[PDB]
Design a protein around this ligand. Structure first.
Ligand SMILES: [C]C1=[C][C]=C(S(=O)(=O)N2N=[C]C3=C([C]=[C][C]=[C]3)[B@]2([O])O[C]2[C]([O])[C]([C]OP(=O)([O-])OP([O])(=O)O[C][C]3O[C](N4[C]=NC5=C4N=[C]N=C5[N])[C]([O])[C]3[O])O[C]2[N+]2=[C][C]=[C]C(C([N])=O)=[C]2)[C]=[C]1
Ligand SMILES: [C]C1=[C][C]=C(S(=O)(=O)N2N=[C]C3=C([C]=[C][C]=[C]3)[B@]2([O])O[C]2[C]([O])[C]([C]OP(=O)([O-])OP([O])(=O)O[C][C]3O[C](N4[C]=NC5=C4N=[C]N=C5[N])[C]([O])[C]3[O])O[C]2[N+]2=[C][C]=[C]C(C([N])=O)=[C]2)[C]=[C]1
Ligand SMILES: [C]C1=[C][C]=C(S(=O)(=O)N2N=[C]C3=C([C]=[C][C]=[C]3)[B@]2([O])O[C]2[C]([O])[C]([C]OP(=O)([O-])OP([O])(=O)O[C][C]3O[C](N4[C]=NC5=C4N=[C]N=C5[N])[C]([O])[C]3[O])O[C]2[N+]2=[C][C]=[C]C(C([N])=O)=[C]2)[C]=[C]1
Ligand SMILES: [C]C1=[C][C]=C(S(=O)(=O)N2N=[C]C3=C([C]=[C][C]=[C]3)[B@]2([O])O[C]2[C]([O])[C]([C]OP(=O)([O-])OP([O])(=O)O[C][C]3O[C](N4[C]=NC5=C4N=[C]N=C5[N])[C]([O])[C]3[O])O[C]2[N+]2=[C][C]=[C]C(C([N])=O)=[C]2)[C]=[C]1
Lengths: 257, 257, 257, 257
């Protein structure tokens, strides 16, 4: 496949509904060698199981809240992947109280802080820590949301964190391009799922989106995974510092009703 | 390849330096069946020759200045491709007097008109004419330039035409998504070439670009072709109405010096 | 008045409800000396009457479709204002057939032509004609619509025209900057009126807007007039090449329902 | 004055050269009643003196790092202004180590934290504290920089902070709109000063700008003050959630050299 020869590290797998699961599957199908991380002991077994299904046994703990955890993970990856071709950052977080109702009333100093630490800083943290082990032609990827560009109900502070993330993509791209590294983000649409969200009234969001999206449907983790694989392959060599909208055209339309 | 089974029509091939040549090569490598058009008798033989090299013998005349030429071409394609999976619009034009010096002084009613007719209207003209023969899952693609988003010296009126083009992409995406059609544009960087441009002081443009581009180089028709092939494949199903910047991050940086 | 000592030329007044009327009223209130042009005989008296109310007797014909018309209007204007300080361009026209239905179907070569010629080229056309009559510190203004940036049902090719116009603003800005001239555009939201708009199902556009607009109402020609006055005044000295949205935060929110 | 009958609170005055000083001067000139806050004891007298010149004796301390500080400042402010009409937020801070060199290297968890906390969260923090003291028709203003939108050498994490701030503007705009409050930001260009900036090789930023800025000069706190006054006045009633660029067309041109 177009990823054959590539050794990628994938984060934020938590279930078969996880965007990163979809990305992992796709990258594997295009012939990449994958490594996985997990946040805690609660997820360890699920990921190990998924890993194995995708021919991997490089499963490491990483909680991006702790620089030490990041360092230690990269230290262990190195034993087996002294050098590698990048990573997919699919992590995010904020306290629930934060995503409910009036943004001004909801937001707090600490929530803002957490949302931004986990959801935005963490991406560069990882780059900072594995910078030396990345190969030229390596690609870093993160996932964002329209929430960052427009004010979305209930999305509240994640909107801010995402905007920070997308700026991060650009500052990182600029900093690392000269050494062979490309950095982009995929801004995906709300994915239709069964589970339950943090975004309040997500179910509606999905409903409305399908009706007014040019392609007339929500996207899938497949849709998202296919773009990520491309964006992480040498086929995208000319693209860096970009936020690609994978939302079936939702963002470019208006008043479709 | 990821384009296997796909029947694409490619325009604007004029030489081995043509962006569309690069797109054609790439699409062919990913297993698509290609058809070509040519503007006039002066180019007919070169294209026929390229076509053959890419296993095609569907070479038709099309001058997008004439609706009749468009209709007639689509009529003939139909004999052999009653239905097909889209097309790549890589056409553009403006009178030379137009791209030299102060924009206000240079621009004229007629130049503006021509630039916009050929460079922007032509894309929807083609869609209008082959709408009925497109298959669900079909993808339409055009090529644009930063010139459309920023004021670029000498680029003058093409800048306007390009802005019209990029708006066209969105209006077309919105109109055709519901029937299975996706429409995007690639905004490519200035490509390093030997030939001579219409854009005055292009050589400099290339020079400056390489120095301040995050990847530290100009892109290639390969870079561009690889993105187009992806954007025309089912791998991009979740992307429509988008203007993807394939310029190695040039647009996202500033004052790099 | 912050406009005191300015001679500004106002285009496209056609009723007490026209956006240009509101721009005129504000400018006059802020101390500007005004002049008016009208499109054709049928509007002569009306405009002649408004002008009276606005303490002016400078009323000329000008059909932007004709270069000679523009040359002449300025030739005449200069008999009384050999130098002035900016002209407000509130003009645009598409054939109605163009504004209803599927863009791709509705669109036509001629329709496209006319829309851009009148709605876009015209703005530079006038700049070009009075360039030497302008004083340092002059400012040119035009009026856009969100349709330039997003696909909006029925707006169709007007959307492409506006996009072209907004690109014009920057090119013009970049060319006349060094000689003391600023060029900007105001992108107004839909203004609730009683008459009938050439734009299809506009009433609904109105209803929807107020509900989801952050300020919870539609803007007035008053609101628009005021921003207009400011942008043509020395108070906006640091602003050029700008598309200022004056639509109550509408373009920035998403899924407010 | 178009600000007559308004009570506006001004933040971040630290010298005669501070952007807030210029915003104050303009607002005062346009008839606004002003109040000031200072960060710490070391600035008390200075601000107390400016205020005097600006016909005010409302001078309070406020360190946005502390919620209690904000609560108290407003508690005190309310003894004299139980209701007012908007506060101007001209505050931001990063640790210097952060602003020099390779972003990825320079950056650090704490640096990132502080930058966003002070430069971004603070703005909503204040909104949140005086929300009930605000009159219908109030307006909040903040100051950004192009670094939010583009990667700029050395600006580094401040770039992420600003991006976060600009997202805040929209979220805030969308939340307080219905209750009569507008929120906007002015993205100013680099202002030529004599002192020394915490920002690295800034002088050069200055030199470069004037050369390539469409108006061919840097903006003044005067230019910025004026736009500021307007945006906090009823004249800008139709404007909310907006990032107005006040940098002489700089962000819009490309390759002017
Ligand atoms: C409260 C809350 C939480 C969280 C959040 S986040 O994450 O951020 N998100 N989510 C979801 C969503 C979103 C958006 C929209 C919609 C939805 B977001 O905002 O973003 C997202 C993210 O980023 C990504 C992913 O997602 P998904 O796949 O879905 O997810 P999950 O499965 O859950 O996963 C996640 C992950 O992460 C991790 N972490 C956390 N924390 C941590 C971690 N790691 C390490 N460390 C630490 N500390 C966990 O574990 C998991 O695994 O993508 C995105 N998106 C985008 C777009 C769209 C989407 C959808 N879904 O549709 C998604 C918020 C709130
Ligand atoms: C004067 C002048 C002319 C022209 C023009 S255009 O075309 O538009 N262009 N070119 C170039 C350039 C540009 C931009 C930038 C740079 C450069 B533009 O603006 O755009 C472009 C286009 O669109 C496309 C393509 O290109 P290329 O590939 O290079 O080209 P060629 O080879 O030349 O080819 C073209 C074509 O077309 C055709 N046509 C015409 N006309 C017509 C036609 N067809 C049909 N009909 C009619 N009527 C011919 O024949 C040929 O084949 O892409 C683009 N780009 C973008 C970006 C970048 C680039 C580079 N190169 O770098 C490109 C202008 C002015
Ligand atoms: C069918 C058609 C379509 C369109 C047109 S227009 O003009 O272009 N428009 N209208 C309306 C509207 C719009 C948009 C949106 C909405 C609505 B549009 O597109 O735009 C507009 C314009 O531009 C301006 C102003 O308007 P108004 O004021 O409303 O209107 P009127 O009153 O009618 O005025 C106009 C004018 O122009 C003129 N012209 C024409 N042609 C010509 C002229 N002049 C000279 N020459 C020539 N050739 C007449 O006469 C008159 O005065 O603004 C805009 N806007 C924007 C935004 C918003 C708005 C509202 N309304 O809301 C508006 C056409 C047709
Ligand atoms: C090292 C560092 C960095 C940064 C900062 S900041 O503030 O942030 N900045 N600065 C400067 C600049 C910028 C940008 C660009 C350029 C330059 B930034 O980033 O920003 C700015 C700001 O925001 C505003 C204002 O500024 P200015 O006026 O210039 O300054 P000053 O005078 O110094 O002021 C400030 C203020 O703040 C305050 N704070 C702090 N912290 C705190 C406070 N308060 C309270 N609390 C707390 N905690 C002090 O005190 C003072 O007063 O604007 C801006 N900008 C924009 C644009 C442009 C510009 C110019 N300059 O050009 C500016 C820091 C550090």
């Amino acid at each position: 496949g177009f990823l054959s020869g590539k050794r990628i590290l994938v984060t934020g797998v938590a279930s078969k509904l996880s965007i990163a699961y979809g990305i992992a599957q796709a990258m594997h199908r295009e012939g990449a060698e994958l490594a996985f991380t997990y946040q805690n002991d609660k997820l360890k077994g699920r990921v190990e199981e998924f890993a194995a299904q995708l021919g991997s046994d490089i499963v490491l703990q990483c909680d991006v809240a702790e620089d030490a955890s990041i360092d230690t993970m990269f230290a262990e990856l190195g034993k087996v992947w002294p050098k590698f071709d990048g990573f997919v950052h699919s992590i995010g977080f904020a306290p629930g109280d934060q995503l409910d109702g009036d943004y001004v009333n909801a937001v707090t100093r600490e929530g803002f802080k957490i949302a931004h630490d986990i959801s935005s800083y963490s991406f560069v943290a990882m780059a900072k820590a594995c910078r030396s082990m990345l190969n030229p032609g390596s690609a870093l990827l993160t996932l964002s949301y329209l929430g960052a560009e427009r004010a979305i109900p209930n999305y509240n502070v994640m909107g801010l964190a995402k905007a920070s993330l997308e700026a991060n993509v650009r500052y990182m791209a600029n900093a690392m391009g000269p050494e062979g590294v490309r950095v982009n983000a995929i801004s995906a649409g709300p994915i239709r799922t069964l589970a339950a969200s943090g975004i309040k009234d997500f179910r509606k969001m999905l409903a409305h989106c399908e009706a007014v999206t040019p392609i007339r449907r929500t996207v899938t983790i497949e849709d998202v995974g296919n773009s990520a694989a491309f964006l992480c392959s040498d086929l995208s060599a000319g693209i860096s510092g970009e936020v690609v909208h994978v939302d079936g055209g939702f963002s470019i339309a208006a008043m479709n009703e």
